[PDB]
Amino acid sequence: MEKENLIIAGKIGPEPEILANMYKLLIEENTSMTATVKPNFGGTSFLYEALKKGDIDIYPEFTGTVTESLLQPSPKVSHEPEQVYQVARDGIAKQDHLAYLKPMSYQNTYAVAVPKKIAQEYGLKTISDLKKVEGQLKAGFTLEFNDREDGNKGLQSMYGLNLNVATMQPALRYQAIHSGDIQITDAYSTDAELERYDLQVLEDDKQLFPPYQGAPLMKEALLKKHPELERVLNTLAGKITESQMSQLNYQVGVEGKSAKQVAKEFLQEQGLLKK
Ligand SMILES: C[N+](C)(C)[C@@H](Cc1c[nH]c(=S)[nH]1)C(=O)O
């Protein structure tokens, strides 16, 4: 009886798809609940509004994204990842009555990336160095990174950078930078494409980017109906290194492995999942 089915969605990319499947695997093993993973469901605003509306039940959301996009007005937060989690978790519960579980260990930050030869040619080590060459290089940014105060709007406001920006589909920006039609893109720090395409991440010297740790986001009402979801999904808390998540992304995004299988093998190897 009562085999309730949860909708777990992810933002664009292998990582949310991997994360969502880990949520499904954990949920189905340890609760009387099934789960459906919705890969590549949308961007932050869509996932967030889908959650509040009940179209989805869980998705992995990132701490700095809670503080910077989701919370309005955005609070001025530190760079301590734990403090940023607490503001996110308390802020989003007050604002929208969403429960935000404990963050995973790794950080997946927005990272301004250039090909390694571009960085050598133009002497680019930090984001500030782009001011030197903002009239020579072409940037390709996701639409969301463009519109985000911690994205390109913050490249303008904090760095003074007025880059020549073309808004890209997320999956195209990496092929553009590789083939040469753009020279700057908004990478995600754990993206396998960084290592695969000789992309060098420019250092965030003015510290525009907040901490970004992922954790399940969910209505508080769902957590009251199923309190076991907190214990169950929190076995991921403080776990998964950038190196581990990067390898998982390689497997799904580069090797074409199934995200469920990659998540499953990993949770099993970590002892987080039977067999
Ligand atoms: C984790 N991250 C890199 C800081 C972004 C990634 C992201 C934002 N929108 C989509 S789609 N992906 C986020 O989830 O906010």
Curated annotation (Swiss-Prot):
<protein>
    <recommendedName>
        <fullName>Ergothioneine transporter EgtUBC</fullName>
    </recommendedName>
</protein>
<keyword id="KW-0812">Transmembrane</keyword>
<dbReference type="GO" id="GO:0006865">
    <property type="term" value="P:amino acid transport"/>
</dbReference>
<keyword id="KW-0472">Membrane</keyword>
<keyword id="KW-1003">Cell membrane</keyword>
<dbReference type="GO" id="GO:0043190">
    <property type="term" value="C:ATP-binding cassette (ABC) transporter complex"/>
</dbReference>
<keyword id="KW-1133">Transmembrane helix</keyword>
<dbReference type="GO" id="GO:0015697">
    <property type="term" value="P:quaternary ammonium group transport"/>
</dbReference>
<comment type="similarity">
    <text>In the N-terminal section; belongs to the binding-protein-dependent transport system permease family.</text>
</comment>
<comment type="subunit">
    <text>The complex is probably composed of at least an ATP-binding protein (EgtUA) and a transmembrane protein (EgtUBC). Probably undergoes significant conformational change when bound to ergothioneine.</text>
</comment>
<dbReference type="GO" id="GO:0031460">
    <property type="term" value="P:glycine betaine transport"/>
</dbReference>
<keyword id="KW-0813">Transport</keyword>
<dbReference type="GO" id="GO:0015418">
    <property type="term" value="F:ABC-type quaternary ammonium compound transporting activity"/>
</dbReference>
<comment type="function">
    <text>Part of an ABC transporter complex EgtU required for the uptake of ergothioneine (EGT), a natural low-molecular weight (LMW) thiol antioxidant. Responsible for the translocation of the substrate across the membrane. Also contains a C-terminal periplasmic solute-binding domain (SBD) which binds to EGT with sub-micromolar affinity. Binds L-hercynine about 10,000-fold less tightly than EGT. Cannot bind the structurally similar compounds L-histidine, proline-betaine, choline, ectoine, carnitine or dimethylpropiothetin.</text>
</comment>
<feature type="region of interest" description="Ergothioneine binding domain">
    <location>
        <begin position="2"/>
        <end position="275"/>
    </location>
</feature>
<comment type="similarity">
    <text>In the C-terminal section; belongs to the OsmX family.</text>
</comment>
